[PDB]
Design a protein around this ligand. Structure first.
Ligand SMILES: NC(=O)c1ccc[n+]([C@@H]2O[C@H](COP(=O)([O-])OP(=O)(O)OC[C@H]3O[C@@H](n4cnc5c(N)ncnc54)[C@H](O)[C@@H]3O)[C@@H](O)[C@H]2O)c1
Ligand SMILES: [Zn+2]
Length: 377
């Protein structure tokens, strides 16, 4: 079982099959409690909750008095990352027999929506209770589940109310990616490529070379019982864990600014195109625009911009606002240069790359609005 440290503790545990034969046992022995609360959505729970209920019972059977496992299922979608849902979960926890107390260990089984929501619930339940992250999406495995950043959204913005609350454990089971929708897997690759581009030209090269194999496995038709990533586990785990390790490294150390490469323009685009277009899709276009911005300022070589554009496309991500899929889903929406500048103002410090794997500076750089408007043209 591969382990990765974060903030001094060895909380990240990664491998294929953890959910089926490692987590329940580990929670009972390492996160001892009388009460375990599992929060997930109906899409994810319908697939993974049954096996775990059994793994838990078997693991708890030995302990005495045996602990309980309580399950809360939220509707899928970001609509659930709200004040009302947080309050409903808390009320439900307080309605148990007996009510969930300070020893409760909350299990966040899901993507960034469930992870953000669940972590925030854990942070304030009776002023704070332990929780673990069990990321089921690619973006969650390498980004959202690491760092302790929790929150909910309000009608005025994303993640505006929340808290920094570190999970006791982060179980990364790559088998969850076997059922993750193709579009979501691709969406998550935006963060993986971003991380390689700002830290390792060698890792970026590995991604370029593994693109066809991985995407093939993702788009593959699986037989009722076989594993989707059959003979490419080592490759997948390597590429995914490289991004999670970087995120962990950054969180454990201005350097975190680099993690926002592609997000200055990316977030501006998303503010306009969401919810039709996903975060990673917006950031992919953002990485291309920000790479072109650096080239405009003569900081990044054109050859480098081409590699970024092709690597993003090789994983199925859009590289321009003129992308066919984007326009089809955004019928009626348009990202005017002014609308994009307006959004970037509410964020100008953009992360600039001098070479793949090499940032211009160990932080975001200042850019004149004049130059930004030219790359958005
Ligand atoms: N905490 C942070 O620092 C941070 C960083 C980045 C993004 N985010 C947050 O992440 C959220 C987006 O999360 P996301 O992209 O993971 O999407 P998501 O959590 O909305 O999940 C996407 C969809 O996939 C389904 N799904 C998830 N895992 C599955 C699996 N293994 N098999 C089958 N279906 C599965 C879900 O039911 C859902 O419908 C946003 O709300 C954003 O604000 C937070
Ligand atoms: Zn992002």
């Amino acid at each position: 079982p591969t382990k990765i440290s974060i903030l001094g503790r060895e909380s990240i545990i990664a491998d294929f099959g953890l959910w089926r034969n490692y987590v329940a046992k580990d929670l009972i022995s390492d996160c001892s409690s009388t009460t375990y609360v599992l929060v997930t959505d109906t899409n994810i729970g319908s697939i993974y909750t049954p096996s775990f209920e059994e793994a838990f019972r078997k693991r708890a059977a030995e302990i005495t008095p045996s602990p309980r496992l309580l399950i809360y299922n939220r509707p899928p979608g970001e609509v659930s990352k709200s004040r009302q849902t947080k309050a409903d979960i808390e009320d439900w926890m307080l309605s148990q027999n007996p009510p969930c107390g300070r020893d409760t260990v909350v299990i966040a089984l899901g993507g960034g929506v469930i992870g953000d929501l669940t972590g925030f619930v854990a942070s304030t339940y009776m002023r704070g209770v332990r929780y673990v992250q069990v990321p089921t999406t690619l973006l969650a495995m390498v980004d959202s589940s690491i760092g302790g950043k929790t929150a909910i959204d309000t009608p005025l913005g994303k993640n505006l109310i929340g808290a920094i609350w570190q999970p006791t454990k982060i179980y990364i089971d790559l088998e969850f990616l076997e059922t993750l929708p193709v579009r979501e897997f691709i969406n998550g690759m935006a963060e993986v490529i971003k991380t390689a581009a700002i830290s390792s030209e060698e890792e970026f090269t590995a991604l370029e070379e593994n693109a066809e194999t991985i995407l093939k496995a993702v788009r593959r038709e699986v037989t009722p019982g076989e594993h989707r990533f059959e003979g490419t586990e080592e490759i997948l785990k390597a590429r995914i864990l490289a991004s999670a390790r970087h995120k962990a490294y950054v969180v454990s150390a201005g350097l975190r600014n680099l993690l926002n490469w592609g997000h200055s323009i990316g977030h501006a685009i998303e503010a306009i195109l969401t919810p039709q277009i996903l975060h990673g899709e917006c950031v992919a276009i953002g990485m291309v625009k920000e790479a072109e911005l650096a080239r405009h300022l003569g900081i990044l070589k054109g050859v480098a911009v081409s590699r970024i554009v092709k690597c993003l496309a090789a994983y199925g991500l859009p590289t321009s606002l003129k992308d066919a899929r984007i326009r089809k889903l955004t019928a009626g929406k348009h990202c005017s240069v002014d609308q994009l500048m307006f959004n970037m103002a509410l964020d100008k410090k953009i992360v600039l790359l001098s070479a793949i794997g090499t940032p211009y500076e160990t932080r975001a750089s200042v850019v004149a609005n004049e130059d930004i408007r030219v790359v958005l043209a």
